[PDB]
Amino acid sequence: KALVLALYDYQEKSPREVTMKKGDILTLLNSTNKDWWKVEVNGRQGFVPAAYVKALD
Numbered sequence: 739k740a741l742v743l744a745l746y747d748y749q750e751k752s753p754r755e756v757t758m759k760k761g762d763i764l765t766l767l768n769s770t771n772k773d774w775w776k777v778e779v780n781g782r783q784g785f786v787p788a789a790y791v792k793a794l795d
């Protein structure tokens with residue numbers, strides 16, 4: 739699966755979200771929504787704002 743780059747820190751604020759740090763390389767799981775993408779960070783999966791990551795490939 740594709741990788742995305744965290745452009746900002748984001749702290750999860752709902753049970754379906756996940757936290758990321760700027761510079762993190764996240765695995766993209768689902769980009770079907772315009773605003774929230776499902777990613778894998780560490781060993782957690784959840785949603786982060788699509789604007790706060792950049793797809794690499």
Ligand SMILES: [N+]
Pocket residue numbers: 750755756757782
């Ligand atoms: N998290």
